[PDB]
Amino acid sequence: GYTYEDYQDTAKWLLSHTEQRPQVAVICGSGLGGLVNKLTQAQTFDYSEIPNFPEGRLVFGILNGRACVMMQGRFHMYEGYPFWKVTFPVRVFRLLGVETLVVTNAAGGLNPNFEVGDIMLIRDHINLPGFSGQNPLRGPNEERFGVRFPAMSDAYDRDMRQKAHSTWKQMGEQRELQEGTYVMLGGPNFETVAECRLLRNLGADAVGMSTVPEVIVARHCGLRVFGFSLITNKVIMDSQGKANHEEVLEAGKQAAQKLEQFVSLLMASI
Amino acid sequence: GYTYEDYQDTAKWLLSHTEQRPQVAVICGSGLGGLVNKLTQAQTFDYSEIPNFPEGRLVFGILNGRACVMMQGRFHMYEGYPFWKVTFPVRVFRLLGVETLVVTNAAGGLNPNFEVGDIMLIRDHINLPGFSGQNPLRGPNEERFGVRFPAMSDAYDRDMRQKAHSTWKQMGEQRELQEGTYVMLGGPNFETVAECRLLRNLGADAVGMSTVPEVIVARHCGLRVFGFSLITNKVIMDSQGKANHEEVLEAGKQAAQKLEQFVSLLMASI
Amino acid sequence: GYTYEDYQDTAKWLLSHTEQRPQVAVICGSGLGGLVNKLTQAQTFDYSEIPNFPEGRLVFGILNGRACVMMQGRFHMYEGYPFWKVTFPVRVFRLLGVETLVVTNAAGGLNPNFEVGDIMLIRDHINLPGFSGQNPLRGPNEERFGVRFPAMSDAYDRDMRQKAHSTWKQMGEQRELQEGTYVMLGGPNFETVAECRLLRNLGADAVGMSTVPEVIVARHCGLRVFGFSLITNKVIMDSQGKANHEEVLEAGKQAAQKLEQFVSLLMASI
Ligand code: HPA
Numbered sequence: 001g002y003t004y005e006d007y008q009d010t011a012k013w014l015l016s017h018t019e020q021r022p023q024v025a026v027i028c029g030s031g032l033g034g035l036v037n038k039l040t041q042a043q044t045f046d047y048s049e050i051p052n053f054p055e056g057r058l059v060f061g062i063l064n065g066r067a068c069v070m071m072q073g074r075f076h077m078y079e080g081y082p083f084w085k086v087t088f089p090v091r092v093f094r095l096l097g098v099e100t101l102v103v104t105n106a107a108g109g110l111n112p113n114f115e116v117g118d119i120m121l122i123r124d125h126i127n128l129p130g131f132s133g134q135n136p137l138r139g140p141n142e143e144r145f146g147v148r149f150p151a152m153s154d155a156y157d158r159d160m161r162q163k164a165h166s167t168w169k170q171m172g173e174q175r176e177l178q179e180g181t182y183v184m185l186g187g188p189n190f191e192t193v194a195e196c197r198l199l200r201n202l203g204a205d206a207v208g209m210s211t212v213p214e215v216i217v218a219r220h221c222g223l224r225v226f227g228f229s230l231i232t233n234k235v236i237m238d239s240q241g242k243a244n245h246e247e248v249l250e251a252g253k254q255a256a257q258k259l260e261q262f263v264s265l266l267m268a269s270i
Numbered sequence: 271g272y273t274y275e276d277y278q279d280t281a282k283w284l285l286s287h288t289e290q291r292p293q294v295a296v297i298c299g300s301g302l303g304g305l306v307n308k309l310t311q312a313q314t315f316d317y318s319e320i321p322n323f324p325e326g327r328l329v330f331g332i333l334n335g336r337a338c339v340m341m342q343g344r345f346h347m348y349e350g351y352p353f354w355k356v357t358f359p360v361r362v363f364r365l366l367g368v369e370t371l372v373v374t375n376a377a378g379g380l381n382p383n384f385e386v387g388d389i390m391l392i393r394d395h396i397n398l399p400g401f402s403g404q405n406p407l408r409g410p411n412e413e414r415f416g417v418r419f420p421a422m423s424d425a426y427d428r429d430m431r432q433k434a435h436s437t438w439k440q441m442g443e444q445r446e447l448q449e450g451t452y453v454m455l456g457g458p459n460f461e462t463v464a465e466c467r468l469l470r471n472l473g474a475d476a477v478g479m480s481t482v483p484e485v486i487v488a489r490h491c492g493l494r495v496f497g498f499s500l501i502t503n504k505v506i507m508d509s510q511g512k513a514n515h516e517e518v519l520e521a522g523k524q525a526a527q528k529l530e531q532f533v534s535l536l537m538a539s540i
Numbered sequence: 541g542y543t544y545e546d547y548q549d550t551a552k553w554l555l556s557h558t559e560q561r562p563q564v565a566v567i568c569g570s571g572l573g574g575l576v577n578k579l580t581q582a583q584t585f586d587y588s589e590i591p592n593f594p595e596g597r598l599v600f601g602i603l604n605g606r607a608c609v610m611m612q613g614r615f616h617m618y619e620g621y622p623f624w625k626v627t628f629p630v631r632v633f634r635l636l637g638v639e640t641l642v643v644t645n646a647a648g649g650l651n652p653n654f655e656v657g658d659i660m661l662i663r664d665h666i667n668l669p670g671f672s673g674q675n676p677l678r679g680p681n682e683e684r685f686g687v688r689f690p691a692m693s694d695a696y697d698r699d700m701r702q703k704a705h706s707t708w709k710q711m712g713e714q715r716e717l718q719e720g721t722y723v724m725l726g727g728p729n730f731e732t733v734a735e736c737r738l739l740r741n742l743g744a745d746a747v748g749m750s751t752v753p754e755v756i757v758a759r760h761c762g763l764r765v766f767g768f769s770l771i772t773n774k775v776i777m778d779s780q781g782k783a784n785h786e787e788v789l790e791a792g793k794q795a796a797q798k799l800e801q802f803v804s805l806l807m808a809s810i
Pocket residue numbers: 106107108109190191207208209232233234243
């Protein structure tokens with residue numbers, strides 16, 4: 001993996017190249033990267049220019065009177081990266097002094113009540129790769145970050161979920177805010193019909209290929225976490241059509257505007 | 271992994287060592303290797319003599335007026351091979367100009383209606399190792415082969431399944447052709463009772479240790495896929511007997527003759 | 541991995557540094573390490589002094605008139621060790637002439653009928669990492685140890701389970717001996733609520749992060765296996781408290797005394 005020092009160096013480099021001092025880190029994923037704008041006093045860095053960062057920009061700025069750092073593009077295991085690389089940035093954020101992490105993503109809907117365009121607050125997750133030992137904490141533990149056996153049952157901050165449901169009310173949305181279980185699998189291919197039925201019977205509400213690893217690490221080093229998925233699909237019958245990456249579209253399709261205001265409004269609630 | 275070039279080289283070597291130009295690739299697995307005979311204008315190559323091939327023979331010839339290339343022996347992850355090695359041959363076939371792939375295997379029956387000696391057309395699969403990131407597509411994507419996020423819900427060609435059920439009718443078999451969900455796990459030990467019950471509740475019909483990876487790759491680079499399992503077992507009560515590799519026997523026990531004619535007859539149906 | 545020779549060397553070194561010739565190997569895990577005492581003619585070795593051993597002491601002695609070798613501390617995959625390292629000692633034991641293996645551990649209870657302080661005889665297991673290919677037998681097979689495809693449906697010796705339920709009767713315990721399915725996942729974080737519900741619906745009774753690999757290897761080279769879990773937890777509602785490693789406590793809380801006599805009494809039953 002990386003050593004404590006590597007994290008530190010990277011955090012020190014950041015601190016001396018910007019005056020920004022974020023309190024919140026937001027990780028934007030798969031077609032979610034619309035908030036660049038809305039940001040005030042923005043400063044951007046290419047991942048390539050930040051020492052030790054994995055092979056895509058880091059932007060600092062103020063969101064709604066709140067100092068943020070945003071990950072514009074994230075890392076996936078299906079790209080060939082080990083989880084210790086995918087989660088490297090989470091640890092740096094903690095070293096910058098961040099206290100809260102917002103994770104977001106696009107996912108396929110398993111719950112029949114779901115509709116394309118829906119937003120699902122992540123109340124909980126299912127770590128399939130973790131079932132088999134693929135875990136960002138695998139390996140000797142780093143005391144400076146956290147304990148050997150972190151608990152995960154309270155990962156998704158309850159209070160933030162409460163505020164998000166409140167904010168949405170004020171937004172006057174026509175549809176309700178969904179809430180549920182996100183399941184992570186490796187990708188990169190899309191699931192078969194059997195697979196989907198299986199996931200659904202296991203109690204999952206949405207399926208994707210990221211986020212979980214980042215939550216675990218976050219929770220391990222003490223960050224408060226809040227996350228949500230933008231729903232975009234999905235196939236459970238043997239008549240049909242197939243899943244398409246061109247549902248990056250849906251991420252634009254109406255999402256951006258709503259998502260953008262939602263996160264913005266939410267900033268006032270930390 | 272291997273580079274595009276490696277595939278190509280291997281395909282070029284093959285093309286200049288044989289006059290055969292297959293349209294169909296068939297992968298024979300675990301005691302299924304009886305069709306060597308029946309083949310016309312046969313040409314065999316030891317995997318060891320073909321550059322870049324994984325550590326077992328490749329035979330070209332004509333089956334029922336159809337030019338084929340057959341993999342006599344396949345690779346398993348439980349042997350220590352990464353999926354990029356297990357699936358290497360699929361990519362070479364595409365580069366030879368193959369268009370259809372037939373995959374076959376031996377598996378333990380989960381569906382109680384199943385009987386030793388049964389043949390199950392694979393309508394769909396469950397990729398357990400894929401759940402955790404063990405996937406032949408893991409890693410940077412190769413555009414020359416296919417897209418980043420291939421769909422898998424229509425993997426098993428519907429039209430071929432229709433023809434196979436037709437051919438079987440004409441064969442006048444006493445028993446019916448089964449059809450169902452194949453689940454892949456890593457092996458090499460056989461499953462426990464708990465494991466089996468679990469697999470069954472997940473909707474699987476048959477369990478084995480191969481094929482899935484090969485399908486995924488196949489589908490990724492555009493081959494039409496058709497597959498089937500020869501059923502040979504399996505334990506779900508805590509009175510009993512245990513699973514034996516000496517059920518290679520069953521693969522002979524009556525299978526060969528039926529399987530052989532089935533595949534042969536099927537050739538006329540591509 | 542290790543070569544046959546490495547095992548042998550290690551077994552030879554042991555044999556010439558002690559007069560003890562164990563027949564039973566017991567693996568003590570997570571806060572279970574109380575039996576050091578009770579042992580007679582004890583001889584201890586630090587894992588660090590035994591050639592080839594993974595990075596914690598091996599103690600030989602007599603338990604209840606029975607010659608034993610005990611592993612005081614075991615290896616976990618979540619520590620970064622591959623299964624071939626975690627299971628190395630099992631193979632050495634066979635080479636020392638051991639015939640029976642007792643495995644033990646601490647686990648979280650999934651079965652609602654379970655209570656902290658309960659003892660659960662392991663009747664069967666669920667190998668989640670094995671589902672995905674993470675298996676100590678992965679790789680070329682070693683004939684000197686066992687067959688290529690070992691069966692696992694009769695892993696937990698039936699006769700020992702019968703005797704353990706007999707011994708417990710004589711112990712006059714106030715509560716009954718539980719019996720059930722142990723499920724292994726990688727760790728090191730504790731499970732979420734969703735995860736737990738899932739495991740339970742899959743038929744598991746207890747969940748932990750060890751043992752399974754050791755059983756498989758044991759069974760592969762012919763050892764008779766008996767195992768049990770000491771129950772210590774666990775969270776299935778979204779009111780609650782979280783899982784704590786300070787339930788090492790429970791391993792002391794009353795266990796030690798009972799466990800200690802239980803294993804001791806059991807020695808007379810091999
Ligand atoms: O259907 C899907 N499956 C997996 N990941 C996804 N991310 C968006 N949609 C999907």
